Design a protein around this ligand. Structure first.
Ligand SMILES: [Cu+]
Ligand SMILES: [Cu+]
Ligand SMILES: [Cu+]
Lengths: 71, 273
């Protein structure tokens, strides 16, 4: 049962999520994210810090980027 | 062939280590280590094939990966070996490790950019090429994302776990490997990456030279755990889908198995074990 989709502006940047197993985008650029067995999530820009949800992972990415575009 | 505590390196050893690392970077060899690491970090999943992380092979895989890197360093300067960082002891931004004559310090608050040491972007000697976060300079925020580094006490609790690993052999596993990796429990290995911040907190963590020192110590802890538990050994031992069994070969080398890496003394020894 994949999480629900989401779309919001977080710290001036648009973050979106949607079931594929699940895709996340930061300003239109896809961000690699992964789900852990226990349900938590991580992203390539925060791979050792599990967070509860995909949106949490997207927000963590925006935080990490400090305004920088995602490659 | 002896891996020493970073805190004990001489001025010359620090100099030679830095120069060797910088030459691998210049020649383009260094970036390939970063790329390989990111590839496995991105493919290893709890529900499927997993080789480099969140799996029993996390330890032997990184042991071999570090050997690859150390051998590359030795091809530049044969006297160089990988030193290790005992984060349970050297837990502050003032550890000699973060001095300008070694790895440089934390990044400035504005953009996390490291401003001193041989790897600061200003030197023109450490371009961050293999990346996700589009910025091209080394970044760090020591102790920014997580309050404290693992304590000796916490490390001890983990070293006390008898079972090497346990089904389902992934991030949900109980046992030594997963507790050392950090997905469960007090969190050792994972927390260190978070504590350093910057590239170290990402899939392209090897962009920061400390990555090697961090893993050199994680590797030492595995060797210590072996000493405490002579009656325990690598698992699984055969026929486990998606997981590298003891006598199964590991990617990307394909010619080496966990069984070939259990004994570190066949490759190196520690200053003190
Ligand atoms: Cu790794
Ligand atoms: Cu991932
Ligand atoms: Cu690591």
């Amino acid at each position: 049962a994949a999480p629900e989709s989401f779309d919001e502006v977080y710290k001036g940047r648009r973050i979106q999520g949607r079931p594929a197993g699940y895709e996340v985008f930061v300003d239109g650029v896809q961000l690699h994210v992964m789900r852990n067995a226990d349900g938590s999530w991580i992203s390539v820009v925060s791979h050792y810090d599990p967070v509860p949800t995909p949106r949490a992972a997207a927000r963590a990415a925006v935080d990490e980027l400090q305004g920088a575009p995602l490659l | 062939t002896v891996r020493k505590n970073q805190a004990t390196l001489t001025a010359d050893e620090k100099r030679r280590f830095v120069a060797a690392v910088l030459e691998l970077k210049r020649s383009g060899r260094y970036d390939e280590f970063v790329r390989t690491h990111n590839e496995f970090i991105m493919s290893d999943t709890d529900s499927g094939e997993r080789t480099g992380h969140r799996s029993p092979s996390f330890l032997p895989w990184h042991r071999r990966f570090l050997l690859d890197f150390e051998q590359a360093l030795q091809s530049v300067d044969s006297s160089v070996t990988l030193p290790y960082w005992d984060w349970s002891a050297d837990r502050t931004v003032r550890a000699s490790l973060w001095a300008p004559d070694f790895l440089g310090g934390t990044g400035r608050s504005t953009d996390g950019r490291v401003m001193d040491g041989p790897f600061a972007a200003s030197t023109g000697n450490w371009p961050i090429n293999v990346r996700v976060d589009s910025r091209t300079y080394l970044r760090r925020s020591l102790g920014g994302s997580v309050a404290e580094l693992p304590t000796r006490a916490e490390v001890e609790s983990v070293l006390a776990i008898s079972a090497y690993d346990l089904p389902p052999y992934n991030s949900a596993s109980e046992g030594f490997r997963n507790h050392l990796e950090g997905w469960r429990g007090v969190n050792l290995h994972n927390r260190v990456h978070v504590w350093v911040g910057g590239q170290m907190a990402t899939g392209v963590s090897p962009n920061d030279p400390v990555f090697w020192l961090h893993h050199a110590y994680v590797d030492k802890l595995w060797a210590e755990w072996q000493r405490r538990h002579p009656d325990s050994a690598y698992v699984p031992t055969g026929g486990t889908p998606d997981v590298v069994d003891l006598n199964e070969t590991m990617k990307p080398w394909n010619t080496v198995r966990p069984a070939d890496l259990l004994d570190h003394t066949a490759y190196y020894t520690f200053d003190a074990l």
